[PDB]
Amino acid sequence: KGKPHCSRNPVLVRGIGRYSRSAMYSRKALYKRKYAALATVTKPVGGGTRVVKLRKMPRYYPTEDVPRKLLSHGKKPFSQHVRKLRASITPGTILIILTGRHRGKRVVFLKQLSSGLLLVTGPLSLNRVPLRRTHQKFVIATSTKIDISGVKIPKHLTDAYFKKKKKYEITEQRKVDQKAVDSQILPKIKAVPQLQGYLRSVFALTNGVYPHKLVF
């Protein structure tokens, strides 16, 4: 025994290492670390005691059946996938929700969960939008970034706690999660020159006013 060390070549590009395999002979201390060369159970019963077996054979076979698959190369499930982002999205920037019962609304970003969804948080007060998830792809990012360095963002509000149950009702658990996550946010939006007439109002298209041209 002798605890497990970290890898001794820094990663240069995916697949490729850094230090070549005679010079890397050095670093795994190769030269100086040479070497050379369940079934059944027996319980008591009321002279005799039985021999029981764990996993006995089945009592119905089926008449026809499928055969085993060829193993795929490198196919992990969702849980183990790798999560990304975009450049414009950073913590505290301004997001435009574009799809649900809230659509066109100006909504603030807080923290990307480990399911990969966002946390698009309206300050329930102003818009009418609470703690919620939305999905990278259906959310435009915007150039405005009031900072969210110094406040507090809770842990227990993790991605399963949101996941659905079954007149769903707002219990007394999601009311100190509601006003305490947002009253740390609320002293930094009103302090900017005239920003709480804009998160409340809705954006939309008119004419002369084309998606492909303008910056937002």
Partner 1 sequence: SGRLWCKAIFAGYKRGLRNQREHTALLKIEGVYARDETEFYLGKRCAYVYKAKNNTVTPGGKPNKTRVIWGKVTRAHGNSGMVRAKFRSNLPAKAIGHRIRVMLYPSRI
Partner 2 sequence: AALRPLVKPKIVKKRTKKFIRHQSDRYVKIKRNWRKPRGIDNRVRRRFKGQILMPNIGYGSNKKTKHMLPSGFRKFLVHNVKELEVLLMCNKSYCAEIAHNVSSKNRKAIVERAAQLAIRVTNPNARL
Partner 3 sequence: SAHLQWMVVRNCSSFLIKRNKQTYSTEPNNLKARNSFRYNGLIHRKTVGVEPAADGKGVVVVMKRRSGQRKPATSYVRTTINKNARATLSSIRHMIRKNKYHPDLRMAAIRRASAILRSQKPVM
Q: Catalog residues that contact partner 1 under the rule CB under 8 A.
A: 88, 98-99, 103-104, 137-141, 202-206, 210-212, 216
* Comparison of 64 and 169: residue with beta carbon closer to partner 2: 64
Give the phi and the psi of residue 177 in degrees, each rounded to 5: -65, -30
C-beta of 67: minimal distance to partner 2 in Å?
Answer: 11
Cα distance between residue 216 and residue 213, in whole Å: 10
Q: Does 1 bind RNA (CB under 7 A)?
A: no
Cα distance between residue 17 and residue 194, in whole Å: 53
Cα distance between residue 38 and residue 140, in whole Å: 58
Q: Which stretch binds RNA (CB under 7 A): 36-44, 120-128, 169-177, 192-200?
A: 36-44
Q: In the Cβ-directed half-sphere of 15, how many Cα atoms lie within 13 Å?
A: 0
* Comparison of 35 and 60: residue with beta carbon closer to partner 3: 60
Rg (alpha carbons) of the chain, rounded to whole number: 29
Q: Which does 58 bind (CB under 5 to 8 A by kind): partner 3, RNA, partner 1, none?
A: partner 3
Q: Which of 66, 160, 205, 214 binds partner 2 (CB under 8 A)?
A: 66
Q: Which of 48, 77, 150, 197 binds RNA (CB under 7 A)?
A: 77
Structure-block tokens of residue 81: 């996938």
Q: How many residues bind partner 3 (CB under 8 A)?
A: 8
Q: Which does 39 bind (CB under 5 to 8 A by kind): partner 1, partner 2, RNA, none?
A: RNA
Please provide the distance, in angstroms rounded to a whole number, between the alpha carbons at the two ends of the chain: 58
Structure-block tokens of residue 38: 């369940």
Cα distance between residue 35 and residue 109, in whole Å: 57
Site for partner 3 in 52-91 (CB under 8 A): 56-63
* Comparison of 89 and 113: residue with beta carbon closer to partner 1: 89
Do residues 96 and 109 lie in contact, with contact meaning Cβ atoms separated by under 8 Å? Answer: no
Cα distance between residue 203 and residue 140, in whole Å: 12
Binding site for partner 3 (CB under 8 A): 56-63
Binding site for RNA (CB under 7 A): 13-16, 22-23, 25-26, 31, 34-40, 51, 53, 57, 65, 67-80, 115, 163-164
